[PDB]
């Protein structure tokens, strides 16, 4: 049970944390374009 919960925890942390990282990077990479409605990305 310990190792199974370890797997579940590690997978959830990996997915949710990497997704949060990617979302943050995407958000702030688009931000200079989001502030530029008069420009084409």
């Amino acid at each position: 049970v310990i190792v199974l919960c370890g797997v579940a925890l590690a997978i959830l942390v990996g997915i949710a944390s990497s997704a949060a990282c990617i979302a943050k990077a995407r958000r702030d990479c688009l931000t200079p374009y989001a502030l530029a409605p008069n420009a084409t990305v």
Binding site: D28, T31, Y33, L35, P37, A39
Partner: protein, 153 residues
């Protein structure tokens, strides 16, 4: 002229400002304070913290009232809340000493009455008072220019 801009207020007094460009409101993040227009207050700001700014799309009932941005910046005087600033070599340069805290979010304007920059702060290095500002690159992508020590106003 500036009627399109709006103040940001804290403790019942203005402590910053905000502006609408291309239908997107922006206010400095460092300026803790509420917005005068209740319909602007209803918008959900997106925290563009990488530019010390937060923004949100304002509804179409003010579609025509947004400021229009322009990326062209020939070297010369650009209009400002206290007058105008000399743009040079990419720097927005204030005639040294004017301005100060409580003025972030003020647009900077072309003589054509179109917005070109937003005030973030400012200081002097040894020859001119530089303003930290957010602006759009020649390619239109927005960028933050902030000569060191141009602390947020």
């Amino acid at each position: 002229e500036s009627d399109k801009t709006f103040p940001i207020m804290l403790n019942g007094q203005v402590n910053g400002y905000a502006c609408v460009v291309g239908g997107r409101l922006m206010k400095p993040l460092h300026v803790e304070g509420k917005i005068d227009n209740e319909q602007l207050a209803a918008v959900k700001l997106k925290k563009a913290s990488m530019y010390d700014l937060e923004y949100g799309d304002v509804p179409q009932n003010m579609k025509s009232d947004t400021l229009q941005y322009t990326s062209d910046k020939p070297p010369g005087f650009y209009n400002w809340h206290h007058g105008a600033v000399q743009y040079e070599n990419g720097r927005f340069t204030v005639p040294r000493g004017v301005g100060g805290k409580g003025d972030s979010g003020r647009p900077i304007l072309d003589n054509r009455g179109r917005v070109v920059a937003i005030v973030l702060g400012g200081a002097n290095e040894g020859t001119r008072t530089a303003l930290s500002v957010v602006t759009w690159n020649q390619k239109g992508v927005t960028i933050k220019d902030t000569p060191e020590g141009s602390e947020p106003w």
